Structures are given as structure tokens and as C-alpha cells.
Amino acid sequence: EAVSDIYKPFWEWAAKTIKERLGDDLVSYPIPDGYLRKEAMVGESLAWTQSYGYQTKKMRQIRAAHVNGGASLQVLNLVFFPHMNYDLPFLGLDLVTLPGGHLIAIDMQPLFQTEEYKKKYAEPCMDMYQKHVKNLPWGGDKQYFSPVFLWTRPQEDKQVETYVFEAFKDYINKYLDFVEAAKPVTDPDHLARIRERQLSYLQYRAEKDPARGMFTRMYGPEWTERYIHGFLFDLEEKMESGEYKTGELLPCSDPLNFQPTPL
């Protein structure tokens, strides 16, 4: 038997790190009713999706979907979304384990591909990237890529538990370094372009995310569309709603949660 919940230690470390390094400012982000813990039968075993959601003064949303339907179906989809008054990149950590094998996509998806953006956010990561890409070779077959995109297909669970885990850890820590140092953008022209790039990226993810197929099979189309557009890649809904106010906390009374929520 292969490791059942290979990304459990990944999420636990991320939660510990988020809790410690963002502790002062970290508050809950609202998880819509019906999308905290979703279970279905697959095959043949129970298959659940656990959601986690947080926010800070600089981070519009940190959210994870942790999926587990046994060794053959495991996903950890963790993404950091900055507020629109910062020029920060996203941090995306998309870890997927299937019968075919592992699919690992780790990146700080940049708002811009200019030399000055790369100078600011790519070049400080080059050492980290070159270190980890040695162990995590290109995974095969762009405007949202950074120079330090790690796209790899480990063939053995041990590679995930070691090399992928260390890369996972380094990219989170390096990203949170950027977040600490980042300062509000006040120039209106810069803010207009930041918002354009954020909306373009989130529209792309909401429309083309590969989990749509998996979630539709497990829970049906309606739940899948609401999860994707209403939580995982929810900026456009929150903006059209009028809930999103740049740099402002989204009201939510739920307490911080970092552990599975028994259904």
C-alpha cells in the first residue's frame, strides 16, 4: 500500500508556518455554507474535500482545498492571493497524486513579465529555484509562468515526501518574506494595471482549472462551479458583489481553523 494521505504533513507544516509568521494579522476568510467539508463515495472509499481559508491586511485570501479519496486520489491546492493594492505575485502550490503518478506545480505566478518585475521578485529566488529544480525536473508539456516555476512529475512517493516537501517549504518561506517587505501601491495607474493582471489570472484559473473535471465527477457540476467561482478563485464574484474593498478585511466571525472539521 502507498501512503494514504501524503499531503497531510504538507498542510500541517503550512498551517504551522502561516499561524506563526502571520499570527498578528491572520483572521478567518469566509468559507460559504456547504463548502467546508464535502464527502462522497468514489469507486471504493470515502472521498472528502477539506477547505481552509485565511486573510490578512496584505493577503486578500489564503485558501486550501485538501482532497483525499485514498492513495489513488489526493490533492492539496494552496494559493495565496494578495490584495490589489500590492504588486506581489501569487503563490500557487498545486500538488496532485493520481494512479498515473504525481503532478506538482509550484510557482509565484507574477503579475508582470517585465525585467523590473523579474528583478524584484524572480531574481531573489534564483538560488532556491536552481537548488530544487536539480531534484525536480521539468514535467513536460505561459503568460502566468515565473522564471522559477517548478513543474515536475515525481514517480515515487518518497520524492514527494523529501524533495517536493523541501521545495514546498522554501517557496512558502520566501514568499512570506516578500509579503512582509511589500508596501502599498498608491499610484492610480499602477493600481489599474495590478487589478487588470489579477482579474485576468483569476478568470483564467476559474475557467480552466483542471480540478473542475475531478470535482464534477465526485460532487456534480453545481457544487463544482460554486466551489471554483465562489471560493477557490472567487475574486470576480466578490468584486461584482461589492464585497471586495481593496486592502480591506472581508468580515467573518468564524475562528481560525487549521485541522479537519468532522462532518
Author numbering: 2 to 44, 49 to 146, 152 to 273
From the paper:
BV IXα is then the substrate for many members of the ferredoxin-dependent bilin reductases (FDBRs) that catalyze a regio- and stereospecific reduction of the tetrapyrrole pigment. However, during the reaction, a second aspartate residue gets involved and likely serves as a proton donor for the proton coupled electron transfer to the A-ring of the tetrapyrrole molecule. This reaction catalyzed by PebB is a formal reduction of the 2,3,31,32-dien system of the A-ring of 15,16-DHBV. Here we solved the crystal structure of the PebB homolog PEBB (nuclear encoded proteins in eukaryotes are denoted with capital letters by convention) from the eukaryotic cryptophyte alga Guillardia theta. The eukaryotic mGtPEBB is a globular single domain protein that shows the characteristic FDBR α/β/α-sandwich fold with a central antiparallel β-sheet, flanked by α-helices.
Therefore, we designed an expression construct for a truncated version of GtPEBB lacking the first 83 amino acids, which were annotated as chloroplast transit peptide by ChloroP. Incidentally, this construct contains the full FDBR domain and reflects the mature GtPEBB (mGtPEBB). Crystals of mGtPEBB diffracted slightly better, showing the same space group (P62) and almost identical unit cell parameters. The structure of mGtPEBB was refined at 1.9 Å resolution to an R factor of 21.1% and a free R factor of 23.2%. The first three residues (two residues of the linker peptide used in the expression construct, one residue of the mature protein) and residues 45–48 and 147–151 have been omitted because of missing or weak density. When comparing the substrate-free and the substrate-bound GtPEBB structures, only minor conformational changes are observed upon DHBV binding. Both models superimpose nearly perfectly, showing a root-mean-square deviation of 0.31 Å (PyMOL super, 217 Cα atoms). Substrate binding mostly leads to a stronger coordination of the mobile residues between helix H3 and β-strand S7, forming the “lid” of the active site. These residues could not be modeled reliably in the substrate-free structure but showed defined density in the substrate-bound structure. A second function is the strong coordination of the catalytically important residue Asp-219 by a salt bridge, present in both the substrate-free and DHBV-bound state.
